Design a protein around this ligand. Structure first.
Ligand code: FDA
Ligand code: GRG
Ligand code: GRG
Length: 452
């Protein structure tokens, strides 16, 4: 078959892949990005389509404008299980037309020298001499089966992790996902009968009975259009998520016009710390494939762009040292862990705590205000549950006279702090990875026991 040579092959054109291509463009490298979907459908994976504005600023990512921005967001309303307590968290964000913005990032990258092949699937990994050296591609637009050699492969295939799962299991880059370390999520976009009240605010409903292990949401895409859905924890033996959706939709969205359904669908959502290493010999993994999703609120589009940024930086470093080993690409880990990874690890622990709380716990915690918005902002943005904040919450929890998991909040905060420092001390070289990973596992397995 025909053979082509590129500096970098990016597999997947989602938020992760497109950002990597964008950040790498116009810097002396010959880059190819491929995606199985047609151009017009790239980026249309079921999503809430809510992304913080801060991510676009930090990474120098172009703001979503025109038809790419459906609704401006100025905050989030958080509802208690009994709907009695409502927390308001202010902050600027965007409700996106995800495919439209995704395709512009691709189009701009293409205008900057990046070659993009749609309707192209990476079938077989080229793994020779202990290295990832490219992939076999099938372009069904031209019915060609091409062999493409690259110095670095950027695996950005989303939750399917379809490419790296075909690599030898001895590679640390083939680390798989535990069922309980993920959520299944489902959403629909419908027009509403009445205009949406406070349509510039997202709505999140916490309820372990209507959405166990996750939450319900109501994300306005306009004055009369809303992205409504839910997420539940996988590996728990829960019935189909659509059973939950169909049963409790009217409670969280009584205003929707069910005859005006625009889109519907669901997918898997990783909810844990990222891959212990997101780089190895000749390969970097980003996005959902590298588990870059926020373990608490399930947001992954912002951190996917971050992973693409770090992938670009690491690859440039590799070419400047002529070293495409794990060691040569190791800055990928250092960059991402400091930018978002260390936060994920802390929130990974906090998630396990939150998912085991009862509705009574959450009702009590919110009504009695165990934490304030100043620290809630600090919590899900820096991953830090300050010990002073936990102490203040524990003094309130001490007023509870019934048995509750809430009483372990101080211990949870200490565990979050411990694993946070452990990730900030990420191994400088691949030779220290195994020792560090086992130390992380010990912290996690210990914490799981402490919740019982
Ligand atoms: C229902 C629901 C709701 C939400 C969310 C998820 C879900 C399922 N998330 C998470 C968010 O959707 C997700 O984390 C990111 O879109 C991940 O971006 P990626 O580019 O990694 O994956 P993504 O799946 O978007 O990209 C993968 C791409 O690779 C392609 N591909 C796969 N295998 C291939 C192969 N072998 N060859 C070629 N191409 C291949 C696919 O075709 C696809 O285009 C979210 N996030 C957030 O921040 N805000 C929110 O509101 C939500 N809400
Ligand atoms: C539904 C699933 C699976 C995930 C959703 C993920 C979420 C909640 C995304 C919300 C993103 C968004 C639009 C946030 C806007 C509201 C907000 C509190 C933003 C905070 O970000 P910053 O702008 O940095 O906050 P500051 O106000 O401190 O600057
Ligand atoms: C986890 C379960 C079952 C319930 C809790 C679900 C919660 C508490 C979600 C919290 C929503 C929240 C306060 C989000 C923080 C605001 C925000 C979206 C900031 C921007 O996101 P980043 O990508 O972290 O930056």
């Amino acid at each position: 078959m025909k053979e082509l040579k590129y500096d970098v092959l990016i597999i997947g054109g989602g938020f992760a892949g497109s950002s990597a291509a964008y950040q790498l463009s116009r810097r002396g490298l010959k880059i190819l990005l491929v995606d199985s979907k047609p151009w017009n459908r790239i980026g249309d994976k079921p999503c809430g389509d809510a992304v913080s504005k801060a991510h676009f600023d930090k990474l120098g990512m172009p703001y979503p404008k025109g038809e790419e921005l459906e609704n401006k967001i100025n905050g989030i309303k958080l509802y208690s299980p009994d709907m009695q307590t409502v927390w308001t968290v202010n902050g600027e964000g965007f409700e996106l037309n995800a495919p439209l913005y995704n395709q512009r990032v691709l189009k701009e990258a293409q205008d900057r020298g990046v070659e993009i092949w749609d309707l192209t699937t990476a079938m077989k990994p080229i793994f020779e001499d202990g290295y990832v050296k490219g992939a076999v591609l099938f372009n069904r637009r031209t019915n060609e089966e091409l062999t493409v050699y690259s110095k670095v492969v950027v695996e950005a295939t989303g939750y399917s992790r379809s490419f790296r799962s075909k690599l030898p299991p001895e590679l640390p880059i083939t680390e798989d996902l535990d069922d309980k370390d993920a959520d299944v999520a489902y959403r629909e976009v419908l027009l509403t009968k009445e205009d949406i009240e406070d349509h510039d605010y997202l709505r999140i409903f916490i309820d372990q009975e209507t959405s166990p292990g996750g939450y319900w949401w109501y994300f306005p895409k306009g004055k009369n259009k809303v992205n409504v859905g839910l997420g539940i924890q996988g590996g728990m033996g829960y019935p189909s998520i659509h059973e939950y959706y169909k049963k409790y939709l009217d409670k969280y969205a009584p205003d929707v016009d069910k005859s005006k359904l625009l889109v519907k669908g669901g997918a898997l959502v990783p909810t844990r710390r990222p891959l212990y290493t997101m780089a190895w010999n000749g390969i970097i993994v980003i996005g959902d494939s590298g588990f870059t999703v926020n373990p608490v609120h399930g947001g992954g589009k912002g951190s996917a762009m971050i992973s693409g940024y770090c992938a670009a930086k690491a690859i440039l470093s590799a070419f400047e040292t002529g070293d495409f080993s794990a060691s040569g690409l190791w800055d990928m880990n250092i960059c991402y862990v400091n930018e978002y990874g260390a936060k994920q690890a802390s929130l990974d622990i906090f998630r396990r705590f939150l998912q085991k709380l009862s509705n009574d716990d959450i009702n009590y915690g919110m009504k009695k205000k165990i934490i304030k918005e100043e620290d809630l902002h600090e919590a899900s943005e820096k991953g830090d549950l300050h010990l002073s904040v936990a102490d203040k919450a524990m003094r309130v929890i001490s007023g509870l006279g019934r048995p509750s998991l809430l009483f372990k909040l101080k211990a949870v905060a200490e565990s979050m702090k411990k694993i946070k420092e452990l990730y900030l001390n990420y191994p400088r070289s691949p030779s220290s990875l195994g020792s560090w990973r086992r130390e992380v596992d010990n912290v996690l397995t210990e914490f799981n026991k402490s919740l019982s």
